[PDB]
């Protein structure tokens, strides 16, 4: 059994986890930016 | 090897760095979501 293998697999899994979290944060962030841009354009 | 384990330790520490960074960003992003909702409610 290659000894570093279970760590390597978990690191790859962790990069998947972090990528998915960053992608979800980007959706919420772009919704926040849109709300800001929409309020700026709509206020008199 | 010791050298390879030093790199793996650096990679795992880096993942902790990135995770903590996105956790802290999520807290700030929650505050900005609340702020834009509070300002939108006042106008729209």
């Amino acid at each position: 059994t290659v000894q570093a293998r279970q760590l390597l697999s978990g690191i790859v899994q962790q990069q998947n986890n972090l990528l998915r979290a960053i992608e979800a944060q980007q959706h919420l962030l772009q919704l926040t930016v849109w709300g800001i841009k929409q309020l700026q354009a709509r206020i008199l | 090897t010791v050298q390879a384990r030093q790199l793996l330790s650096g990679i795992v520490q880096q993942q902790n760095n990135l995770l903590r960074a996105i956790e802290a960003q999520q807290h700030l992003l929650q505050l900005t979501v609340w702020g834009i909702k509070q300002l939108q409610a006042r106008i729209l």
Binding site: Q3, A4, Q6, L7, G10, I11, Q13, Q14, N17, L18, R20, A21, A24, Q25, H27, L28, L31 | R5, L8, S9, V12, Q15, N16, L19, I22, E23, Q26, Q30, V33
Partner: peptide
């Protein structure tokens, strides 16, 4: 989205603790 992100972060927190455990066992 806020609940979805929190769930993803928590999964990452669990995986981070596991990787750190495997690192110490590898050392």
């Amino acid at each position: 989205y806020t609940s979805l992100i929190h769930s993803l972060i928590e999964e990452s927190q669990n995986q981070q603790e596991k990787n750190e455990q495997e690192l110490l066992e590898l050392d």
